[PDB]
Amino acid sequence: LKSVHRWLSAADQSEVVPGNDNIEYFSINEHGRREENRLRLKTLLQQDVVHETKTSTSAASELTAVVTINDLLEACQETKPSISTSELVKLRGIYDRFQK
Amino acid sequence: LNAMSRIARMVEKKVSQHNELTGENISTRRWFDKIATKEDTKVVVKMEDFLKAQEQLTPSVSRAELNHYEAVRANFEGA
Fold it and tell me: How is this protein induced (chain A)?
């Protein structure tokens, strides 16, 4: 989860608005609509149709951003255990109470 | 079951050896219909197996339950 944002969200710079195609409309001055205007024009212009648009830019995978284990280290401090010594003590009994 | 697992391992070794000799063209299941070694499959338990097993098996009841049933008997039979 923490990693998939790399390929999709791309820090809103690495896959979306990547460069030359950021501004293909002209200098808007008639109205102040700047960001929503360009977003609407981009959505409208994306009228092309494609199929089976496969790509394998990943190391050994299709359409994915491989998790850097170094970044995977950032997940250890969030996930939680289930803690109980009562269960540990209780398991003393089922197998012949470890006495008989 | 232990003594017969031993025979299972032995037949596995035999079938692996045969597969190595040939082009590894058959599994154990095919081996058992193409070939048969009846006398080899006759498992005979040697008490070494017993002395192995006896170390591993628990009693079916604890002392807690057994004393209960002992008292029950005492009540009904002891009089």
Answer: By oleate.
DSSP string, A43-76: HHH-----S------SSSSSS--PPPHHHHGGGT
Give the resolution in Å.
Answer: 4.1
A98 touches chain B (CB under 8 A): no
Look up residue A89 and give its two tokens. Answer: 């003590």
CA B19 to chain A, closest CA, distance in angstroms equals: 36
One-letter amino acid for residue B12 of the chain: E
The 3-state DSSP class for residue A80 equals coil
User: Which residue from B48, B58, B45 is spatially nearest to B5, judged by alpha carbons?
Assistant: B45
Nearest Cα residue to B35 out of B14, B60, B63? B14
User: SS3 sequence, B14-40?
Assistant: HHHHHHHHCCCCCCHHHHHHHCCCHHH
In angstroms, rounded to a whole number, what is the distance separating the alpha carbons of residues B13 and A92? 40
Q: Quote the CA–CA distance of A19 and B23 in Å, as a whole number.
A: 61
Query: From its phi and psi, is residue A52 left (phi > 0), alpha (psi between -120 and 50) or beta?
Result: left
Q: Which residues of B touch A96 (CB under 8 A)?
A: 58-59, 62
Measured CA to CA, the distance from residue B47 to residue B4 in angstroms comes to 13
